[PDB]
Design an enzyme around this catalytic site. Structure first.
Site, PDB file in Angstrom:
ATOM      1  N   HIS A 161       0.827  -1.155   0.082  1.00 30.27           N
ATOM      2  CA  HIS A 161       0.005   0.012   0.037  1.00 30.27           C
ATOM      3  C   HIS A 161       0.930   1.322  -0.112  1.00 30.27           C
ATOM      4  O   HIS A 161       0.395   2.306  -0.022  1.00 30.27           O
ATOM      5  CB  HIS A 161      -1.130  -0.140   1.101  1.00 30.27           C
ATOM      6  CG  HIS A 161      -2.008   1.073   1.379  1.00 30.27           C
ATOM      7  ND1 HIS A 161      -2.103   2.193   1.994  1.00 30.27           N
ATOM      8  CD2 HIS A 161      -3.078   1.124   0.446  1.00 30.27           C
ATOM      9  CE1 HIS A 161      -2.850   2.910   1.550  1.00 30.27           C
ATOM     10  NE2 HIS A 161      -3.683   2.337   0.825  1.00 30.27           N
ATOM     11  N   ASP A 184      -6.038  14.854  -1.271  1.00 27.72           N
ATOM     12  CA  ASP A 184      -5.196  13.726  -0.622  1.00 27.72           C
ATOM     13  C   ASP A 184      -3.844  14.951  -0.714  1.00 27.72           C
ATOM     14  O   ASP A 184      -3.673  15.830  -1.140  1.00 27.72           O
ATOM     15  CB  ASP A 184      -4.774  12.831  -1.765  1.00 27.72           C
ATOM     16  CG  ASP A 184      -4.268  11.339  -1.051  1.00 27.72           C
ATOM     17  OD1 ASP A 184      -3.866  11.645   0.158  1.00 27.72           O
ATOM     18  OD2 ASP A 184      -4.498  10.488  -1.556  1.00 27.72           O
ATOM     19  N   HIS A 235      -8.741  11.303   1.306  1.00 29.81           N
ATOM     20  CA  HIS A 235      -7.560  10.412   1.383  1.00 29.81           C
ATOM     21  C   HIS A 235      -6.586  10.624   2.127  1.00 29.81           C
ATOM     22  O   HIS A 235      -5.536   9.753   2.195  1.00 29.81           O
ATOM     23  CB  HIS A 235      -7.397  10.118  -0.075  1.00 29.81           C
ATOM     24  CG  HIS A 235      -7.047   8.401  -0.230  1.00 29.81           C
ATOM     25  ND1 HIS A 235      -5.921   8.124  -0.930  1.00 29.81           N
ATOM     26  CD2 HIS A 235      -7.671   7.375   0.141  1.00 29.81           C
ATOM     27  CE1 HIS A 235      -5.703   6.751  -1.085  1.00 29.81           C
ATOM     28  NE2 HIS A 235      -6.754   6.274  -0.202  1.00 29.81           N
ATOM     29  N   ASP A 256       3.191  -0.333   4.276  1.00 28.16           N
ATOM     30  CA  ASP A 256       3.198   1.047   4.256  1.00 28.16           C
ATOM     31  C   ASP A 256       4.301   1.794   4.616  1.00 28.16           C
ATOM     32  O   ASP A 256       5.353   0.979   5.053  1.00 28.16           O
ATOM     33  CB  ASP A 256       1.590   1.625   5.029  1.00 28.16           C
ATOM     34  CG  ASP A 256       0.336   1.442   4.197  1.00 28.16           C
ATOM     35  OD1 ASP A 256      -0.123   0.410   4.524  1.00 28.16           O
ATOM     36  OD2 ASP A 256       0.085   2.142   3.389  1.00 28.16           O
TER      37      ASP A 256
END
Length: 501
Positions: free
Chosen positions: A165, A197, A439, A464
Site C-alpha cells: 500500500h 490527498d 484520502h 505502508d
C-alpha cells in the site's frame, strides 16, 4: 534544537523493531523539505489544491505534484524507485514517468527503474506487469535501450489481506516523494470530483531510508517471484530482478545532508513477508478488552499480535506520535474505523491513547471522509463508517473504561474533541453532486511534529511507509496550507458528540 516528539517515537520504535532499524524504519538528520525557489511551502504536495472552490477550476496542487514528479525523475542519474497500490501508473502519472525517463536518458544516463504495486486478492489486474513494461518501452521509444526496468505486482497474504500500500517515488536514493496519493488517474486527474490527498517531497538521508524500505519489499518480491500466485514479475532488456538497487546505489558513502530537518522514516512489512523481528524483545500488555459492537473474523493483528507489531513499527510510531502530544493533536484521515467484519472495527491502543489525551485536556481534532462516501463492505465506499457518532461513541466507551465515571468522560470528550467530515469549500459537496472524498493519512502534533505517509489509522495489515517530521517552521507551513483551511470549511460539517451542548 530539541526533538522531544521524535525522541519518544524513536524510543518506541527501537523497543518494538530494533532489527528493522536501517531497513523498515530509520531516523536521520540533515534533510531538506524539497520546495522550489520562491515557494518555500512547495514541499507540501496537495491535490487538487482548490480550497474555497467547489468547482475546482484551477487544480494548482495537482499541477505541482505532477511537475515535481516529472522533475524528480528528469534529474535521475542512476535509479528511479516507484511503489503504489495497483494499477500501474496511468494517465498524467504515467506521462510524468515517461517524460522524466526520456529527459534522464537525454542527459546521457542509464537509469535502472523498479515499479512495484500491491494488488488485493479480489482485484483483477487489467494491465499486468509485462503489459505495462511493454507500454513503457513503447512510450519511451528509442530511449528504452538505456532503461533497465523491473515491473512487479504483488500480494503477500491472501488469507490475511496484505499487499503493498506504500506510495513512494525515490530518485538516486537522494529525493523522495511520499504520501497518500496513488498513481491512479481516475481518483485524482480525470475527475470532476477529485479526491483530496497530500504528498510531501524532501531530499537527503531520509530519501535513502525510503530506498532501504523499498529494498526490503523488493528482496521479498524478487524472491517470491517463484510463487506466481503471489508475484507477477517483468523485466526489460533481459535484466535480472534487482532486489538491492538502492543498496547497490548508495554504496559505502553515508548519505549527504541537504538541510537541517530531522526525520523518522518508518514503514511496515504487513503480513506474509517476515514473521517477527527476531532481534526484538517487545512484549506489550495488549488491550485486554475489545469492543462489543463487532467481532473479528480473521485473526486480529492490530489489537492481538505481538509479532505483527515487531515487523510493523509504523503502527507504534503513530500511537507514539499521538501519545507525545502535550497540547493539541490534529488528525486528518479517510477513516479511523475499518469495516468489521473482516477487519477489527478499530485500533484499541490508538483510541485509548486519544481518550487519554481528551482526559488530560489535550485538544483533539478529527476530520475523516464524509460518511456519505460509504458503499457496502469494500471497493466503492470511501468511508468505513455510517456516522461520525461511531468515532465519538468509541471515545466515550474508552474514556469511561479509563475514568470509570461517565461525568469525567463527557467532560473530557465534549470539552476537548472536535469531530467533523471533510469539506474543502463552503459547499457541502462537489459542484457535480458527489461528496468530498478525503484520502489524507496525516497526523500533526503540537505544531511541531507531523506524519505524512500511506498508513491509515484505521486497521489495515498492508505494507505502508511515511515520514515523521519534527520542525516548528514546517509544522507552521502545514498548519497554514492544510490544517487551518481544512477546519475553516470542515467545521460546517462538525458533529457535536452524543451528550453535549
Amino acid at each position: 534544537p530539541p526533538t522531544p516528539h521524535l525522541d519518544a517515537i524513536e524510543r518506541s520504535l527501537r523497543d518494538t523493531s530494533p532489527g528493522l532499524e536501517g531497513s523498515v524504519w530509520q531516523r536521520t538528520d540533515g534533510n531538506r523539505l524539497d520546495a522550489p525557489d520562491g515557494d518555500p511551502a512547495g514541499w507540501l504536495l496537495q491535490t487538487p489544491g482548490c480550497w474555497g472552490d467547489a468547482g475546482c477550476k484551477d487544480r494548482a496542487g495537482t499541477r505541482r505534484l505532477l511537475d515535481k514528479m516529472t522533475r524528480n525523475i528528469a534529474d535521475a542519474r542512476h535509479t528511479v524507485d516507484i511503489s503504489s497500490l495497483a494499477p500501474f501508473p496511468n494517465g498524467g502519472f504515467e506521462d510524468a514517468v515517461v517524460d522524466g525517463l526520456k529527459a534522464s536518458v537525454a542527459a546521457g544516463h542509464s537509469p535502472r527503474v523498479r515499479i512495484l504495486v500491491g494488488a488485493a486478492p479480489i482485484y483483477h489486474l487489467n494491465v499486468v506487469p509485462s503489459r505495462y513494461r511493454d507500454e513503457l518501452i513503447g512510450k519511451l521509444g528509442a530511449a528504452a535501450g538505456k532503461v533497465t526496468l523491473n515491473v512487479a505486482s504483488m500480494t503477500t497474504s491472501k488469507t490475511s489481506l496484505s499487499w503493498n500500500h506504500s506510495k513512494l517515488l525515490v530518485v538516486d536514493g537522494k529525493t523522495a516523494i511520499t504520501g497518500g496519493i496513488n498513481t491512479n488517474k481516475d481518483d485524482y486527474l480525470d475527475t470532476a470530483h477529485p479526491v483530496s490527498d497530500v504528498d510531501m517531497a524532501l531530499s537527503g538521508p531520509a530519501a535513502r531510508s525510503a530506498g532501504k524500505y523499498l529494498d526490503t519489499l523488493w528482496d521479498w518480491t524478487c524472491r517470491n517471484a517463484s510463487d506466481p500466485a503471489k508475484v507477477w514479475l517483468a523485466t526489460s532488456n533481459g535484466a535480472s530482478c534487482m532486489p538491492s538497487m538502492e543498496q547497490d546505489e548508495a554504496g559505502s558513502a553515508p548519505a549527504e545532508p541537504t538541510g537541517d530537518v530531522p526525520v523518522i522514516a518508518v514503514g511496515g512489512l504487513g503480513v506474509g513477508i517476515k514473521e517477527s523481528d527476531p532481534s526484538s524483545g517487545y512484549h506489550p500488555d495488549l488491550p485486554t478488552a475489545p469492543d462489543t459492537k463487532c467481532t473479528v473474523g480473521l485473526h486480529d493483528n492490530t489489537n492481538a499480535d505481538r509479532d505483527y507489531d515487531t515487523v510493523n513499527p509504523e503502527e507504534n510510531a503513530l500511537r507514539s506520535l499521538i501519545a507525545s502530544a502535550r497540547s493539541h493533536v490534529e488528525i486528518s484521515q479517510q477513516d479511523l474505523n475499518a469495516t468489521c467484519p473482516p477487519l477489527p472495527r478499530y485500533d484499541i491502543r490508538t483510541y485509548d491513547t486519544l481518550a487519554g489525551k481528551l482526559a488530560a485536556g489535550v485538544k483533539v481534532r478529527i476530520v475523516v471522509s464524509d460518511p456519505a462516501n460509504r458503499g457496502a463492505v469494500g471497493s466503492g465506499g470511501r468511508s468505513q463508517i455510517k456516522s461520525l457518532d461511531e468515532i465519538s461513541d468509541t471515545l466515550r466507551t474508552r474514556l469511561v473504561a479509563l475514568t470509570g465515571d461517565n461525568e469525567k468522560a463527557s467532560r473530557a470528550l465534549c470539552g476537548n474533541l472536535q469531530l467533523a467530515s471533510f469539506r474543502s469549500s463552503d459547499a457541502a459537496k462537489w459542484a457535480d453532486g458527489k461528496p468530498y472524498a478525503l484520502h489524507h493519512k496525516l497526523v500533526s502534533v503540537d505544531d511541531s511534529a507531523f506524519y505524512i505517509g500511506s498508513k491509515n489509522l484505521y486497521p489495515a495489515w498492508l505494507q505502508d511507509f511515511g515520514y515523521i517530521v519534527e520542525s516548528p517552521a514546517a509544522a507552521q507551513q502545514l498548519k497554514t496550507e492544510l490544517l487551518d483551511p481544512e477546519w475553516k470549511y470542515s467545521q460546517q460539517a462538525a458533529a457535536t458528540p452524543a451528550g453535549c451542548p
